[PDB]
Design a protein around this ligand. Structure first.
Ligand code: MG
Ligand code: MG
Ligand code: MG
Ligand code: MG
Ligand code: MG
Ligand code: MG
Ligand code: MG
Ligand code: MG
Ligand code: MG
Ligand code: MG
Ligand code: MG
Ligand code: MG
Ligand code: MG
Ligand code: MG
Ligand code: ZN
Lengths: 94, 94, 37, 50, 67, 148, 86, 120, 49, 177
RNA sequence: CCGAGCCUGGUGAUAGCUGGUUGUCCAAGAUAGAAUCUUAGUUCAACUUUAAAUUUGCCCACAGAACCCAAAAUCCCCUUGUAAAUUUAACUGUUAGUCCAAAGAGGAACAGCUCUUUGGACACUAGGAAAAAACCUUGUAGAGAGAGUAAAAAAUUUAACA
């Protein structure tokens, strides 16, 4: 007795969820945090025109470092030492 | 030896009599055994806490299945306390 | 389903939390306005 | 209704919460709610809601 | 001790106590198995780990009269 | 696995930590081959590192057979008579060194599930808990609803 | 437990975060010698050092931007002076 | 339908009660926002999560610094509900080179340049 | 360790419980008067740097 | 300690016979405390596998009181097993037929649903009246207190309390009453 | 065992259709539509993958984008915060999709109904809502006999009258 038509959480008839002081206090806490975020986002330090052209140097020098890193792609170097160390598998005492 | 305790290493008979002899040598009154606490006396699992009191002063208490086991265990406890081999004694210095 | 319905369309859980948080909390004095004043 | 919406002690009102999108609840909400804020749900009308 | 205890806020001073411990044993832990299996997606995977583990013995404790 | 595998409580031999410590590795037995690509690591280890290892550890004893073996072995006998053998087949010198050192640092008992990471042979001070520690007594020790 | 209390007191919400409970060395030689740092402490102090370098970088970049702006405004003023002097 | 939500700029004008509540003087505004990620980036739009990734908040409960400038405040506004913001405060002035290493953060947004690790 | 203490040395756990209760009572006195009073002796905290 | 091994183990894992009086107390609360003590949460050595329970005794189960009209609207329902064997009975009728079954079912519900439930319920003991068999009022240890308080009656309130409590208003003389 | 016998051979007939598809381990990775005797399929596109060359790629700041007949928003977009993006050689696989929230169309302002758009989730782990795909918290992977937190438990009782 007391079944829910179809699935318990969807459709024209679903299971009625209800709210508790637990969830209420949780979300109002989050809302107060969001209010503090709004406050601290207000009162900026500098203006658009003041902050326009200070970081271009750093940005483009970082990007040209990325350029160099991406361009520097070649096969590794090959060595006779690593080539001949394979001969040392047949080592044996006299 | 650290683990194996005194009465586990060395065996005794009539420990109550041994205790009597000991504290008579130490010149103190002959104590009486009195059940301090009881539980399940009629139950199949009797439990007695017997204290050995001299001159209205307690030296040791002992748990036990029966009153005899409780009083002999209290005698054992008092003997340990007098000989200084209590489990809470100073560890061995190295 | 549609937004507008004959029956009361059950709302989302977050929405119901918000609607349960937002109500008229009547400003009442600590003293009832009849017995003391 | 005006004096109730002026004198409500609850600091949190769907007006502010939705116009700011304080918790991304614009998912569950509609653009219509921005003006049908709390009083309306579908065609219905909740006058006690403030 | 049997009759008293000393607890810090949060921890005790260095000069008050001296806890000494000796190393006795270094080992690799016994082979622990990590199997991940999911259903009807041929997702079956295993790995063996032998974490290192060290054994100490507390040899002596002494307290200082400083207080 | 725990239920399939046996278990033990943490313990040490003859109380090794209290008195003078003794590394409970006793004996090593190497089985290495003159030839064999698998035993080249063991040959390098015995030619250079084993000298310094034996110098650092005098209490241990080392035996080397140097016989034909398709897979080189190392056997370790500890104080209790615990024998454990492991294959050094095709192993590098550094991992051989780490292996022999962990053998030296191990104790004389099989690795199995340890039920508890501690061991106190006298855990209780102020007395072990019994039901009557934290409840008072009665005048003349009278049970509830008892006249005399 | 007590995270918000610790926060309002000034300490870490989780005592394992920072403070003497975690930052101090957990073992030293019986002869009184200092043990080497733990890898956790090393990475923590490295993170903090990068953090400080970054903060200094950001602060001095903002200061340089404001300085350049005000210098450009002085440039503007003096070039207006030039214009009307012409 | 659900789209990127424009915020009314009137929201970001603090009142005197708000100033004296949060302890922030409109004059002499701070320079740096310490930021932490508090909310799930899942069940959020791709643009929000990409802004998270570019600000460097893919890791939660890990403080990261940004400037106080509108170019950044835009991103912070659009991902404000996912993060805890606080200003930076320091009594000991900018960290000196000798004390780059022995720095320490506090729960109160403070950055102490010296950390003696010892009670008064 | 709290459980091990409560098991093997109930006296120390009883001392801890007494400490906690006294701190509760100090917190109640503070709830009565937050400031304008001498703070609790055990409610006092250590400042580290 | 300085106790022997087997006696110490015995004294630690021993059972205890607790007693509580249910006269004008709620079955819910008294059964809750009895249940926690039956499975043995009260002792710090609690573990399910270790049968560390204790024996409990309730007294005057007949003289219990609910809060509200539960005597009327609470329905204990059970199916015998046959067609039409679905029976429902109010707490009042079930009390009249068996004054113990209420507290019994209460504890049976409070307890966990393990096989230890039956063992704990037979550890427990119940008596509707102020009367107990010799052994099972002899081998007791302690009588723990009641969960709620008993409000006093006017016949119980002494005179000094009455004359200390101030009178609130002055009635007009011209009134029949 | 005849809608046309049985045997052999072609014949390993063909089968867009069902089924099955063998050792260990790491990573990246479900995706608009068009055409088709085509809608149980396939080619292209798009997505994804690999190895290379190159440089701008993403977020975006004022300005800017219609008369006809009052929306959330969108396009473009320097700075800034970040590190990816495009192109070149090579294929394969996906191309039968479900719920929720929102703007709508059909229907009964029915459907766990069907059809488009924006987003999320699921088809990847975990905790919770009773068990629960799609609801809410939450990701980058281990040992722990350490700790702080996230979402997270429903409240209701009703009517006298001169
Ligand atoms: Mg269903
Ligand atoms: Mg819809
Ligand atoms: Mg035929
Ligand atoms: Mg035929
Ligand atoms: Mg075929
Ligand atoms: Mg086909
Ligand atoms: Mg198939
Ligand atoms: Mg992967
Ligand atoms: Mg066409
Ligand atoms: Mg651009
Ligand atoms: Mg289909
Ligand atoms: Mg459908
Ligand atoms: Mg449908
Ligand atoms: Mg699929
Ligand atoms: Zn009144």
């Amino acid at each position: 007795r007391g079944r829910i038509p179809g699935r318990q959480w969807i459709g024209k008839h679903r299971r009625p969820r209800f709210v508790s002081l637990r969830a209420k206090q949780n979300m109002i806490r989050r809302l107060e945090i969001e209010a503090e975020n709004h406050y601290w986002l207000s009162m900026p330090y500098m203006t658009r025109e003041q902050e326009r052209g200070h970081a271009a140097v750093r940005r483009r020098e970082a990007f040209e470092a990325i350029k160099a890193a991406a361009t520097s792609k070649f096969p590794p170097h090959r060595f006779i030492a690593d080539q001949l160390d394979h001969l040392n598998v047949t080592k044996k005492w006299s | 030896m650290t683990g194996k305790e005194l009465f586990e290493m060395w065996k005794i008979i009539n420990p109550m009599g041994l205790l009597v002899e000991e504290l008579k040598k130490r010149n103190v009154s002959a104590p009486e055994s009195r059940l301090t606490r009881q539980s399940g006396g009629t139950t199949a699992l009797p439990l007695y806490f017997v204290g050995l009191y001299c001159d209205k002063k307690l030296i040791a208490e002992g748990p036990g299945e029966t009153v005899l086991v409780a009083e002999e265990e209290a005698a054992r406890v008092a003997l340990r306390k007098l000989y200084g081999f209590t489990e809470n004694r100073r560890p061995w210095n190295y | 389903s549609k937004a507008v319905t004959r029956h009361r369309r059950v709302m989302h859980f977050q929405r119901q939390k918000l609607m349960a948080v937002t109500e008229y909390i009547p400003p009442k004095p600590a003293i009832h306005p009849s017995c003391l004043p | 209704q005006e004096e109730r919406e002026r004198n409500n002690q609850n600091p949190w009102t769907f007006e502010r919460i939705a116009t700011a999108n304080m918790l991304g609840i614009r998912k569950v909400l509609s653009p219509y709610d921005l003006t049908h804020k709390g009083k309306y749900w579908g065609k219905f009308y909740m006058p006690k809601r403030v | 001790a049997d009759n008293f205890t000393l607890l810090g806020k949060p921890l005790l001073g260095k000069d008050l106590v001296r806890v000494e411990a000796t190393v006795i044993e270094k080992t690799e832990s016994w082979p622990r198995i990590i199997m991940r299996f999911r259903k009807r997606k041929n997702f079956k995977k295993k790995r063996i780990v032998t974490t290192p583990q060290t054994v100490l013995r507390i040899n002596s404790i002494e307290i200082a009269p400083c207080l | 696995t725990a239920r399939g595998t046996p278990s033990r409580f943490l313990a040490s031999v003859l109380h090794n930590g209290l008195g003078r410590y003794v590394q409970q590795l006793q004996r090593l037995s190497f089985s290495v081959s003159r030839d064999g690509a698998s035993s080249r690591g063991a040959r390098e280890f015995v030619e250079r590192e084993v000298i310094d290892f034996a110098r650092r550890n005098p209490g241990v004893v080392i035996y080397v057979n140097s016989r034909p073996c398709c897979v080189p072995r190392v056997v370790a006998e500890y104080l209790n008579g615990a024998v454990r053998e492991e294959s050094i087949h095709c192993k590098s010198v550094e991992e051989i060194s780490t292996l022999v050192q962990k053998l030296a640092d191990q104790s004389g008992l099989d690795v199995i599930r340890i039920r508890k990471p501690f061991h106190t042979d006298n855990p209780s001070i102020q007395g072990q808990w019994h039901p009557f520690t934290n409840k008072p007594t009665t005048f003349r020790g009278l049970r509830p609803r008892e006249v005399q | 437990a007590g995270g918000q209390w610790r926060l309002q007191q000034g300490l870490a919400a989780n005592p394992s975060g920072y403070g003497p409970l975690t930052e101090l060395p957990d073992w030293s030689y019986a002869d009184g010698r200092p043990a080497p740092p733990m890898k956790g402490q090393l990475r923590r102090k490295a993170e903090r050092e990068t953090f400080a370098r970054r903060v200094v970088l950001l602060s001095q970049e903002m200061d340089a931007g404001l300085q350049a702006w005000q210098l450009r405004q002085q440039k503007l003023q003096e070039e207006q002076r030039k214009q009307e002097n012409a | 339908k659900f789209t990127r939500s424009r915020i009314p700029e009137k929201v970001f004008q603090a009142s005197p009660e708000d100033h004296e509540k949060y302890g922030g003087d409109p004059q002499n505004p701070h320079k740096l926002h310490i930021v932490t990620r508090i909310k799930s980036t899942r069940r959020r739009p791709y643009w929000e999560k990409d802004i998270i990734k570019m600000l460097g908040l893919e890791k939660a409960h890990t403080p990261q610094v940004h400037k106080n400038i509108p170019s950044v405040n835009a991103k912070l506004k659009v991902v404000k509900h996912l993060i805890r913001i606080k200003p930076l405060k320091l009594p000991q002035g900018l960290p000196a080179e000798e004390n780059m290493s022995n720095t320490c953060l506090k729960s109160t947004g403070e950055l102490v340049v010296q950390w003696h690790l010892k009670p008064v | 360790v709290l459980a091990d203490l409560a098991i093997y040395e109930p006296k120390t756990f009883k001392s801890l419980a007494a400490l906690a209760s006294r701190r509760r009572h100090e917190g109640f006195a503070a709830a009565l008067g937050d400031g304008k009073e001498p703070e609790g002796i055990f409610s006092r905290v250590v400042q580290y740097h | 300690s300085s106790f022997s091994r087997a006696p110490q183990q015995w004294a630690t894992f021993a059972r205890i016979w607790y007693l509580l009086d249910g006269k004008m107390q709620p079955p819910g609360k008294l059964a809750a405390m009895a249940s926690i003590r039956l499975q043995g949460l009260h002792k710090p050595v609690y573990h399910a596998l270790s049968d560390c329970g204790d024996h409990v005794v309730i007294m005057n189960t007949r003289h219990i009181a609910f809060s509200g009209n539960k005597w009327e609207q609470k329905v204990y329902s059970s199916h015998t097993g046959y067609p039409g064997g679905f029976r429902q009975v109010t707490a009042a009728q079930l009390h009249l037929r068996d004054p113990v079954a209420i507290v019994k079912l209460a504890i049976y519900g409070m307890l966990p649903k393990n096989l230890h439930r039956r063992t704990m319920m037979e550890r427990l003991h119940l008596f509707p009246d102020e009367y107990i068999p010799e052994d099972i009022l002899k081998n007791l240890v302690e009588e723990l207190p009641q969960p709620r308080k008993i409000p006093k009656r006017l016949d119980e309130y002494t005179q000094e309390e009455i004359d200390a409590f101030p009178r609130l208003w002055t009635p007009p003389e011209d009134y029949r009453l």
